[PDB]
């Protein structure tokens, strides 16, 4: 049906919008601390600490697989990146501090992306 082609032409724009948003968020981590998944070879016990790992490349693979149905799912993943880091790492570390900074600077990008999703449907 054509009614599925109109749905696919919207998901394809959402996927096109979410790509810009992901790029803007990832520019707030110039140290690339959140670029890749935490290595299980380097942190063997990680999954004892954190049940749902998340990172930017993992979000990206999903994204290009049109796996985000909406902005709320995309946000959830972003928030995991931040909250996982803030549990696993102590307050006086470079990792925890990078998340605090990513959260603070990522808010401005997400406050406007909310309006652009609602605005353009
Ligand atoms: Na902690």
Swiss-Prot record:
Q: Where, per UniProt, does this protein localize?
A: Nucleus; Chromosome
Site of covalent link Glycyl lysine isopeptide (Lys-Gly) (interchain with G-Cter in SUMO2): 41
List where the protein spans the membrane.
none
Q: Where is the Bromo domain?
A: 9-113
Q: Which domain of life is it from?
A: Eukaryota
This protein's assembly is summarised as: Component of some HBO1 complex composed of KAT7/HBO1, MEAF6, ING4 and BRD1/BRPF2. Component of the MOZ/MORF complex composed at least of ING5, KAT6A, KAT6B, MEAF6 and one of BRPF1, BRD1/BRPF2 and BRPF3. Interacts (via PHD-type zinc finger domain) with unmodified histone H3. Interacts (via PWWP domain) with dimethylated and trimethylated 'Lys-79' on histone H3.
Function, in words: Scaffold subunit of various histone acetyltransferase (HAT) complexes, such as the MOZ/MORF and HBO1 complexes, that acts as a regulator of hematopoiesis. Plays a key role in HBO1 complex by directing KAT7/HBO1 specificity towards histone H3 'Lys-14' acetylation (H3K14ac), thereby promoting erythroid differentiation.
Protein name, as recorded: Bromodomain-containing protein 1
The scientific name of the source species is Homo sapiens (Human)
The organism's taxonomy opens as: Eukaryota, Metazoa, Chordata, Craniata, Vertebrata
Of the parent protein, the shown chain spans 555 to 674 of 1058
């Amino acid at each position: 049906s054509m009614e599925q082609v109109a749905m696919e032409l919207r998901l394809t724009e959402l996927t096109r919008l979410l790509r810009s948003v992901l790029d803007q968020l990832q520019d707030k981590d110039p140290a690339r601390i959140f670029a890749q998944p935490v290595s299980l070879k380097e942190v063997p016990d990680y999954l004892d600490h954190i049940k749902h790992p998340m990172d930017f490349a993992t979000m990206r693979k999903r994204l290009e697989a049109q796996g985000y149905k909406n902005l709320h799912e995309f946000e959830e993943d972003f928030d995991l990146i931040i909250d996982n880091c803030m549990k696993y790492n102590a307050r006086d570390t470079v990792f925890y501090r990078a998340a605090v900074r990513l959260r603070d600077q990522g808010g401005v990008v997400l406050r406007q992306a909310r309006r652009e999703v609602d605005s353009i449907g």
